[model samples]
Target: RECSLTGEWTNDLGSNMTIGAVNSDGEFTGTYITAVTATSNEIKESPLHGTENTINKRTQPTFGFTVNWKFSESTTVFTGQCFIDRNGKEVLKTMWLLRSSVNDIGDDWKATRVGINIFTRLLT
Candidate 1:
């Protein structure tokens, strides 16, 4: 596979997002771990697996995917639509929403960014 979306990546928030595997057809699987912070020293780990199924636009350098992320706590199933930019620095932009309402927090929106590190190796 000659895909660019496979491998370990670190976002601006100091979180580690690792793309463990990817097929030639753009289906992938991975994991993510949030960095320890001052207020909350505990790190949060979640799944980073998804499929890059559709192109964001015609001839564009972006691909769209539906990602399901499972948090460490609570039984909430969070899902989101992510767009990975092939060009530039290879940033992955995601907008997340809950699968069901939990504590009146469903239907809300959250965003995150995962940027690729050129120094990292691409999965073969």
Candidate 2:
């Protein structure tokens, strides 16, 4: 009963993430590079802060991460759970919040989006 979210994951939009080692406190950090963005065709790698769920002293792959794309003027927070599919593949089903910079006089909800993404572990 072990779930390690340490690997490279690529999502449907061709965005990539590399999750590194987890800590004893159910915490981990990683990097995310989005393939599709409003910023530029040349993307940047953002740092991620994550924490796994603890169920009765067991660390599960249900986790959350936040990436502040400092250079992109936006931030996205993702929450997801990981599981092995029938084909022995780790699938990450996640929901995310992309918070765009809103001005004082703004179309409040226009720039904020709640989206879903599927990320699969890359085996190589």
Candidate 3:
């Protein structure tokens, strides 16, 4: 089955995102407005660029995108595939890798963050 990934999405934290139309080449851009963050309670808008691995019009899709924080000196990336719920909801399940400033290699891992989130396409 084929579906369009272009639209707004709400993550587990209730963050809002807008993914632009995917071109034939599977490249697209979008905006991310976070309602929460790991470090600050601030809200900001960040732009993102991602690629879809749906080289063909088939079932299931693998995609990835990166978000650079404008409010902080770190960048976060989301990776995983999209799925269709049995009830017909579209869900993009992803694990995120977030890297921030670290003081030393010994404790560097403390500055790195990781988590998973399901981004569902907002209904029209």
Candidate 4:
């Protein structure tokens, strides 16, 4: 039996992004970058590209989320949830999150850079 996952995660804010790959040893590693442009609203709405809103505007301002899982007979999935710290007292509010099922393609080689551009241009 083998347990591992290989994928990428993009935040709703589009300001933060990461790509990772799991190894046969059942360990995963990846790099993260903050696409949130300085002095720009590129995190929520890209003023230049004309997307008009965040990718996940239907949800909260999901700044950062994650995905981790193991696979055996079938594909098992795990996801990280995010929420608003609202309660007038900084209480932890919970939100439901789902794992994205997508694979790396040949163009994925430019995903990081392209994602940055799309997110920045669409959300900023």
**Candidate 4 lDDT by residue in tens digits, 10-116:** 44554433334433332444443434432333233211100111344333322232323222111112222233234421111223233333365655443331121
- Tens-digit per-residue lDDT, 1-124, candidate 2: 4556989989999899999988888899999988877645677788999898866755336889999785777889999887777777678889999988878655776888898999987878
Summarize candidate 3's per-residue lDDT along 73-104 as a digit string, tens digits. Answer: 88899998878888888888899998988767
Clashing pairs in 2: none
| Ranking of all predicted structures according to lDDT, beginning with the best and ending with the worst | 3, 2, 1, 4
* Cα-based lDDT at residue 15, candidate 2: 93
Per-residue lDDT, model 1, residue 89, is 42
Better of 1 and 3 by lDDT: 3
The lDDT for every candidate, in the order shown, is 0.46, 0.84, 0.84, 0.29
Q: Which candidate would rank higher by TM-score, 3 or 4? A: 3
Clashing pairs in 1: none
How many clashes in each candidate?
0, 0, 0, 10
The TM-scores, one per candidate, come to 0.48, 0.87, 0.87, 0.24
lDDT for 97 in candidate 3 is 90
User: What is the C-alpha lDDT profile of model 1 across 11-121, one tens digit per residue?
Assistant: 555667677555766577666665632244466666655655445332223343333434423222223323334554444544333233234445334322333322232
Best by lDDT: 3
Which of 1 and 3 is ahead in TM-score? 3
lDDT of candidate 2 vs native? Answer: 0.84
